[PDB]
Amino acid sequence: KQYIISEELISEGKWVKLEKTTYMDPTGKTRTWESVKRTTRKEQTADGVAVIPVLQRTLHYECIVLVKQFRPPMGGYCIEFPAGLIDDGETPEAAALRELEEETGYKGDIAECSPAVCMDPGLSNCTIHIVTVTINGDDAENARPKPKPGDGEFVEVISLPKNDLLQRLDALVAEEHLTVDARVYSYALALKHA
């Protein structure tokens, strides 16, 4: 039934633009919406990737590897899956493995790759692939992994046991001013609910 009629640029930065979207409602009436988009999306099947990195080690419980960074939009520190935007011509899988190594030091193995999923669809068109990666933490490459962050990127790695992830997250939120990412929290809730 519904569809876009027009998209009008309101304002365009270096990284983000705001648009006035006109669309057709299912009753047949024209309506508008204010839409956010990134300026950096070319032919990628998505803007970015987030990596679900399952750290596996003999005689250890599996960990989920997370990153903590300052997020200017939020005015504070956030705990998130490792993530970045997909470079032009780069596959979601390569992006995921590359970002994971850059942000964490770990060299993963692809497990699965989602279709493009929407970040906040009442607001933006932004999409990612969620890439599940296993990390063989018994491999020498992953022994004392060092982040290789880019210029102006500053990241702390936090590995939490999968079998207690929601409580460990809650305990971190209790001890500091920090925000957990909604995807991380969703994943931790399902681990509990399962």
Place this chain on the structure above:
Amino acid sequence: KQYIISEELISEGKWVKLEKTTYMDPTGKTRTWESVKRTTRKQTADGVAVIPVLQRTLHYECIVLVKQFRPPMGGYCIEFPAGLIDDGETPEAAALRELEEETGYKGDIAECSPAVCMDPGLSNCTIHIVTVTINGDDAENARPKPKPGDGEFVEVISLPKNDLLQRLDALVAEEHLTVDARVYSYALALKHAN
């Protein structure tokens, strides 16, 4: 160690604004970011998203989801029921109300998250994730009455919790819908548990 120095208004619409954030990086260098905010926030968060666990005896437990046209996306999305928190509403109350409006179901609060960020490299948007159980055998949830507002048009999609990830993948392959990242994350963790 990092913090916000100033925020410059770039553009303000009715619903969304775009700002240029200046912040101190940990090296003591000053840096900028483009940040999106909603103009509607006061509340602990912009919105709520409901994880609605439909429980009917002798049936699989279902997660109740919604499908709607999303003008930013230019298409249809499958999401947790959700909406913005009304001024002076509790997150729990916003959760029950949205769940009723969007699905017709009347549910019970199980747990409620802290405020969690939607896309923190882009926006300051936050939600509470509220886990709600729905006693699908009660008479009030027999023929659920969705009471949605002016211009909302929602379809309800219940999927079994124990196969959620494979059911979503299917809807994407066949219906060309975009699944929400939080929904997808939850689904992944149901599979990844143990």
